[PDB]
């Protein structure tokens, strides 16, 4: 999840909560709120892609 797009060759390292509504998020993912990073699922029993 990200607010706006990126410019060329600039990176984003900021582990802070990003709100998807007018209600505030303060460290807690409760009121229609998520974490801006979620990991992968790399299993050997998968197809290509």
């Amino acid at each position: 999840f990200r607010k706006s797009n990126l410019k060329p060759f600039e990176r984003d390292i900021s582990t802070e909560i990003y709100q998807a509504g007018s209600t505030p998020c303060n460290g807690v993912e409760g009121f229609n709120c998520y974490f801006p990073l979620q990991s992968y699922g790399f299993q050997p029993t998968n197809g290509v892609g």
């Binding site: 060329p8 060759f9 390292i13 900021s14 802070e16």
Partner: protein, 111 residues
């Protein structure tokens, strides 16, 4: 919370770091401070004075242009013409929206 840049002269070399700093309210150097957490880039290299600088931030690069000249006027900027050569082309890759100057002070109030 986001990454910052810092250029510091110690009267013998140049320190350039892109670490995550939690700053003061008035930072300075006592005739000193730079925090450190989770960085990428680090660089080390080498009134009648007048030094001029130009900073640009385009396409993930940080352009710096420089020129020094001996002025001998009182309190203004001169009138002639002199062009500024390129200095360095650092690949820092951050977002820069504000800036602030670091002077040499005495009263070591670290806020």
């Amino acid at each position: 919370k986001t990454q910052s840049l810092l250029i510091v002269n110690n009267a013998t070399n140049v320190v350039i770091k892109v670490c995550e700093f939690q700053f003061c309210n008035d930072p300075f150097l006592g005739v000193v401070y730079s925090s450190a957490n989770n960085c990428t880039f680090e660089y080390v290299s080498q009134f009648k004075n007048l030094r001029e600088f130009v900073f640009k931030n385009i396409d993930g690069y940080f352009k710096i242009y420089s020129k020094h000249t001996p002025i001998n006027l009182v309190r203004d900027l001169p009138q002639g013409f002199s062009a500024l050569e390129p200095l360095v082309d650092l690949p820092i890759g951050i977002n820069i929206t504000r800036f602030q100057t670091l002077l040499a002070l005495h009263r070591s109030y670290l806020t």
